[PDB]
Amino acid sequence: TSLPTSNEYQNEKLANELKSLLDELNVNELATGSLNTYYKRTIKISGQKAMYALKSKDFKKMSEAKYQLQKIYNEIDEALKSKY
């Protein structure tokens, strides 16, 4: 084979950026247990966004979501640091 088209490349990068996160979602969801109810309330909605976004193979939904989940995913780190 040869090389992929523009759309083709970007689209597959986003996706496997996205997936990269959904992979270690569960680990995250689980760290919320200790954390204040937001965190849980938040991550759960962010999680779905992704999984639907990922399956939908549409750039927007996928990046938009890429980012949602990124944020929370680090609204968690910052959290667990003020606690050891």
């Binding site: 204040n36 109810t37 937001y38 849980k40 309330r41 759960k44 909605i45 999680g47 779905q48 966004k49 999984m51 639907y52 399956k55 979501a65 003020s82």
Partner: protein
């Protein structure tokens, strides 16, 4: 639960509605700068969708009793539910609670499947297996009220709980307020 929408399993409702909170007592032990000591504080807001008003008084044997201005911290959302629960109902009397669905999006009405949760301490229209949902439309910059008749079945302190999510968006809010059942 792959529909252009959140699933109810995932909607973790707000619940903690203090009318007040943050009754702490910090101490400005920091290295003064321009004589002014600064304390960064961390505080988790409370679930309630409203404006909070922080009040602060200072005492310093040197400078005395201070009366900081009030300070405003608006907690808001573009979509959220109002559970408008009266002060007190009466066991075995069948009243009407409103839920006010607020949509503040600039431009584009909202479809929402809003869903009263099946209480066992209530003769709602909800059952163990069968839920109670409407897909309902709220124009933008306005509110659709969605009433709900219920019957309070046991005395003491029950809990209403609603839930809505919006289609195609992935926005969602849940809300667990409690009200007071008093006996006849």
């Amino acid at each position: 639960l792959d529909e252009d929408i959140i699933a109810e399993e995932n909607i973790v409702s707000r619940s903690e509605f203090p009318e007040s909170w943050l009754w702490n007592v910090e101490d400005l032990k920091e290295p003064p700068k321009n004589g002014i000591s600064t304390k960064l504080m961390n505080i988790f807001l409370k679930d309630s969708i409203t404006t909070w008003e922080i009040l602060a008084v200072s005492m310093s044997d040197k400078k005395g009793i201070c009366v900081a201005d009030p300070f405003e911290v608006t907690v808001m959302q573009d979509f959220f539910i109002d559970l408008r629960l009266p002060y007190s109902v009466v066991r075995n009397e069948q009243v009407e609670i409103r839920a006010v669905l607020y949509n503040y999006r600039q431009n584009q009405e909202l479809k929402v499947r809003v869903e009263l949760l099946h209480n066992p301490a209530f003769c709602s229209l909800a059952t163990t297996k069968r839920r109670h949902q409407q897909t309902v439309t709220i124009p933008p910059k306005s509110s659709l009220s969605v009433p709900y008749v219920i019957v309070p079945l046991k005395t003491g302190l029950q809990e209403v709980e609603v839930k809505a999510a919006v289609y195609h968006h992935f926005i969602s809010d849940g809300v667990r307020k409690s009200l007071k059942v008093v006996p006849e």
